[PDB]
Amino acid sequence: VGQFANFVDLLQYRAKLQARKTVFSFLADGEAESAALTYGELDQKAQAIAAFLQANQAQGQRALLLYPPGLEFIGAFLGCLYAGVVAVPAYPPRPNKSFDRLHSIIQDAQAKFALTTTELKDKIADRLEALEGTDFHCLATDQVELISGKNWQKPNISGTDLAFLQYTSGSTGDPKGVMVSHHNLIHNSGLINQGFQDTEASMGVSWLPPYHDMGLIGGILQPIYVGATQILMPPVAFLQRPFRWLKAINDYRVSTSGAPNFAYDLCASQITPEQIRELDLSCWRLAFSGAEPIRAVTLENFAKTFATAGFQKSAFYPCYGMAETTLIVSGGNGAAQLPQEIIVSKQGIEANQVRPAQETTVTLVGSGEVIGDQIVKIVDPQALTECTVGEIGEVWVKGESVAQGYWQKPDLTQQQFQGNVGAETGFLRTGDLGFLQGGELYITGRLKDLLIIRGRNHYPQDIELTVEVAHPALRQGAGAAVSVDVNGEEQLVIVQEVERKYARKLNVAAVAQAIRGAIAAEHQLQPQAICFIKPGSIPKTSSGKIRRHACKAGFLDGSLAVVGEWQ
Template identity: 45%
Template sequence: MLTSSITTLVELLRTRAEAHGTRLAFTYLKDGEEAEDAWTFRDLDRRARQIAAALQQRGSEGDRAILLYPPGLSFIAAFFGCLYARRIAVPISPPNPTRLARELPRVRAILQSAEPRTLLTSASIAPMVEALRGVDPEIAKLDVVSTDALTIDAGTWREPELDPESLAFLQYTSGSTALPKGVMVSHGNLLHNMRTIGETFGTSDETTIVSWLPVFHDMGLIGCVLHPILQGSSTVVMAPAAFLQRPLRWLQAVSRFRAYISGGPNFAYDLCVRRIAPEQRAALDLRSWRVAFNGAEPVRARTIREFTRAFGPCGFQPGAFAPVYGLAEATLLVTGDPEGTPPTIAPFHTAGLERGQATSVTGTLEPARDLVGCGRVVGGQRVVIVEPERRVALRDGEVGEIWIAGPSVAHGYWKQPAETEATFGATLADSGEGPFLRTGDLGFVRGDQLFIAGRRKDLIIVDGRNHYPQDIELSVEHSHPAFRAGCTAAFSIDVDGAERVVVVAEADPHGNIANDTTASGDPPAALFRAARRAISADHDIDLHQLYLVRPGTIAKTTSGKIRRQATRAGFLAGSLQPWDVPAASSTATQAVPPPAPAAQIFRDREPTT
C-alpha cells in the first residue's frame, strides 16, 4: 500500500501529490448545492507549501498558529501549511458577531492557553478579524495573515524535520463540563487513527465522502478531511449552515455524488426525518451510502428506527448505520463496527442501570431503556470499564468510567501538567496497569459492544439512584411538540439539602405552543405538565422546575453538545433569557419563573399537579 510506511502528514500529502497529483481531492459546494471550488492533491500541496513558506518567514518552528476560517477549502490548505512549516495548528470556530458576549470568552481562553504568534484567515472575513482586534487585546497582538492573498513563491518552502512524535495541532476540547483544554495531537496519533477509520469502514481510493461537519472539530477534520487523504478518496464538503438551513442538501449530495461514507451527530438524522418531506425523499437514491456514522452525542435507538423507516424506500440499508464512540483525547475513533454490520440495539432494566448494572430485559412490560451499542474496540486499542473511586476494573455488564489505552491516545493537555497526569496517567489500583486515558464517560461492555451511559460529571443522583441527563432531556423533548429537539438541558440543584431535577428547555414558536388549549389558555403550564408526566413515567422522579427559554439560549459546544454545567450556572445566576410568553397565571409562573435569584424561585414555588 502506497501510504503504509508513511510517518508524518507532510510525507503523506507530498506522496499523494507526486503519485496522484491530478486526482480530485476536495470539492466545496456553495450553499450546499453548486460546486464553487475543486482542488486536486497537487493543488492542495502547492497551496500548503506557499502558506508554509510565508510562515517560515515569521516566527519559529513550534510556534502556534490560530486557524480562523469561514467554510470552504482555505482552512484545509492552512492546516497543512502549518504542518509543512512545523507550526502547531490551533483550529477555532469563527465567533458569531451577534453573540460576541457569549463566544469571545472561549476564544480568549484558547488564545491565553495556546499563546499563538500568528492568526491565519481568509480575505473574506479579514474585516471581521480586524473588528475583533479592536475589541480584544489578545487578538490585537497577533500577526494576521490572509492566506488566500499570499504572493510568495511556493518553491521557496523548506521541508522541516518531523517524526511521528511531532505535534501536529491542538484540538481544544468542546468544554461541555469545563473550560476548553488543548489536546496535544501528534502526527503519529493522527496516522494511527486515520488508518483505523479506513480499516474499520473499508474506505479506499474508490470511495467518495460527503461532509457538512465543521472542520475545526475532530470529527470533521480527522474523519472527513485527513482520513480521505490517507485513502486517496475524494471528499465533497459544504458549510454546516447549508445543512442546518436545509437538511435535504446533505442527502441530495450523498445521492448526487454517490457517497460511500457520510455522517454526523444524532440530531442530524433527526432533522432529516422531520424536515425532508415524502415528495422530496422520492428523488433521493441512497443505495451507495454504506457507512452512516453517528457519534459525538448520544446515539438514539428511536432515531435509527425512524431514519431507516423514512429513507429505506430511497435505498438506505439498515446495516449502513454505524454508531461510533470517540473523543478528542483519543484523537477521534475508539469504537465502531465494520461496514455492513447492523447496529446493536438492546433494552436494559432502568432500575438496574440506576444501580450500575446493565441487565437485559426479557419481558415487554418491564421498565427499560433501549441503548445503542457503539461498536467494538478498533485499531488495537484497549478499553477498560473502571470503578472510578476504587480504580478497579469491572466485569461485563457493570457500569463504570471508560478508560482507554493505545496509539491514538494523545500526548496530554497543552501546558497543563496536573490535568494531563490526572486524565492521561491513570493506573489500575490492583494491578498497576497503565497509563490509561480517563474519559469521564460512563459506560459498560456487553459482548463485543461498548454502550455509553452518560457523562460522569453530568450524572444526576436523586434519592440514591443514578439518572443520566440525556435520558431525562429526551423524555421532555418527546412530551410535547413545542420542545425543540436537542435543545434541552437537565441538571440537579440543591434544595433544602436534597438534589432536585431542573430542566431548561428551548420552546419552538412554531410548535403550536401559543395555540395549546390543554391548559385553559395557559401554554407554559401545559408544557410543564407534559414534561413532568413524562419524567415521572419514564424515570420515577419529580420535575422540580421547568424553565422555558428562547431558541438559541441553551449553551452548546462547537460540536453541538449541550453544556449542562454552563446552563446550570446561568440558571442559578438568573442570566438565562426567558421565553417570551403571554401573560401567565400563577401556575404558569411556577412553570416559567421570571429571571430572579434561583433560591427565591425555589422558595416561592409550590408543587404543581
C-alpha cells in the same frame, strides 16, 4: 502508504502519485460546486502557506485558524503541519458576537497568531489587537502567491512532535487543548481505515464543521489518508435543507458519509416523499454515526423513511471517540449486519448494572467494537478497580491514538491520562460511562453530567428526551436536566426552551404539569424547578452541544432568557 510517519510525507507522496485527482470539491450552497483542489494543488498550496508562515516566524508557535468552511481552511491547516506550526482550529468569529470564546482559546493556547481570510482580517484584526496586544499577529493566508512555496523549508518531523491543539467542545467545562501528535493522526487515520475499509475509489461527502473531530480528522484527513475524493459543504447548507446531504450522496455516488444522531432525525423529518423519490442511496455503503448518543428509534426511522430510496439499514456504522483519543476508538457492528442493540433493565442502568428486566426496559445501541491495537477497560471511577461483565463504569482507553495530554494543564493531564487500575497503567480516563457487551462498547453517558438524586443515578439525556416530548410547546434538542443543592440534597432542575409559536401564549402551569408527569412516570423524580427559556437562548458550544453546567449556572444566577418558571 502505510509506511508514512506523518501527513506531510503522505500528502507530498499523493501529490506525486495522484497529482491530477480532485481531493476536495466544495459546494458553498450544498448544491453547486464552487471550488475544487487536486492533490497536486493542495500540496502546492500547503507549501506556499507553510513558507508564508515560516517567514512570519510562526514555526513552533500556536496559530488560531479562523475560516469559513471551505478550501482556505484546509490549505491553512495543512500549511501549519507543513510549516511546523501548532494549528489551533476554531469556529470563526461571527458578526455581532463577542470574541470571549476565541480570546479564551488564544489565552489558553498562548497563541501569537490567528490565520484567517482577507475579509475576516479586515473585520477582526483591530479587535484582536485590542484584546491581545500589538505582539499578536493576525495573518491572512488566502492571497499568498503559490510561487512562494519554493521558499518552504521542510521541518524534520517525527511522530512524537506535536501537530495541532484540538480544543474540546466545552460541553462540561472550558474547552481544554488536546495535544495531538503527528503520530496520533497517522495511527488514528489507520484505525478509521481498518473499520471504514475505504480505498482510493471511495467517494465521500461531508457537511460537518471542519473545525474539530469528525469533520476535521475524519472529514479532511481521512480522504487524504486513503487517496480518495471528498465532497464538502458548509454545515449551515445541510441544517437549512437536509435534502442536500442525501442529494449529494445520490449525485456523486457517495460510499462513505456520516453525521451525529440528530442529523439522521433531521433528514427523516424534513425531507419530503417526492424528494425521497429523487434519491438512489444504494451506493451509500457506510453511514457512520457518532459525537452523540446513538438512538435505536433514530436508526429505525431513518432506515424506514429511506428504504424506498435504497438506503440499507446495514450501512449504519456506529462509532465512538473523542479529542483525547484523536478521534475513533470503536466502530462497526462486528459480525452482525445491523447495529447491535440490547434491551436491558432501565432501573439496572440507574444502578450501574446491565441485565434484563426482572420493571421497565431501555434499548441501547452499541458504539462498535474497539478498532485495532488499542485497549478499552471499564473502570469504577472512584475505587479505580476494573468492573466485571454486566457492570457499568468509566471507559478507560489505552493506545497510540491517545493524545499527549492537555495543553499547559499538567495536573489535569496527570489525573486523566495516567489512569492506573489493578496492574495496569497509562490509561486515558474518557469521562464517559459505559460497558462492554458482546464485543461491543456501549456508552451510557458522561460522568461529569450524571445526575445523582435520592440515591439513584440518572442520565441527563434520558430525562431531557422525556421533557421534550411531554408537550408541543417544548423545543427538541434544546433542554437541560441539571441537579442543584437544596439544603444539602441534590434536586432535579429543568431548563427547557419553548417554541417561538408557543412563546407568546405559554401556559406555564399546564406545560410544567405535563413535564412533571412525564418525569414522574419514566424516572420517579420530582423536579425542584422548571425554567422555560427563549428559543435560541440555551447555553451551547459552538458545535451546538448543550452546556449543562452553564444552564445550572444561569439558573442559579438569574441570567437565563426566562419566559416562565415553575417552583
